Amino acid sequence: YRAIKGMETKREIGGYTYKVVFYENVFQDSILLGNFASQEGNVLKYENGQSCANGPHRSAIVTVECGVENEIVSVLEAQKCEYLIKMKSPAACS
């Protein structure tokens, strides 16, 4: 009944703190981008989050290429209130 969290990667982009719980969801300060729904490849998709107001539901898509450590490289609202999260992590290698 309790969601399991990952490593919690947090980074300040645009003045707000992006938190990637990885197996839960992603936030910006306290504004919920999206929620972990599915893992597609090595990319995790988070949607049904907090409203965007200027569009549909916010969403977050974490693109992981794997690396030495987990870190939020960048986040970009390029898609429909859907935030591209660019990351890497050794735990992503499989």
Domains of the chain and CATH, by start: 1-94 (2.70.130.10)
Closest CA to 13 of 58, 63, 74: 74
**Residues 33, 26 contacting (CB under 8 angstroms):** yes
How far apart, in whole angstroms, are the C-alpha atoms of residue 68 and residue 62? 17
**Residues 24, 12 contacting (CB under 8 angstroms):** no
Size (the chain), residues: 94
Give 27's DSSP letter: E
CA distances from residue 68 to 23, 27, 28, 45, 47 in whole angstroms, order as listed: 19, 23, 24, 22, 27
For the chain, what is the total number of helices (H) and then of strands (E)? 0, 8
Query: Rg (Cα) of the chain, in Å, rounded?
Result: 12
Site of tokens 């794997």 = 66
How far apart, in whole angstroms, are the C-alpha atoms of residue 27 and residue 33? 5
Which uninterrupted H or E stretch holds 46?
A: strand 43-48
**Residues 89, 67 contacting (CB under 8 angstroms):** yes
**Residues 32, 44 contacting (CB under 8 angstroms):** no
CA distances from residue 56 to 59, 66, 74 in whole angstroms, order as listed: 9, 30, 22
How far apart, in whole angstroms, are the C-alpha atoms of residue 55 and residue 74? 22
The method recorded for this entry reads NMR
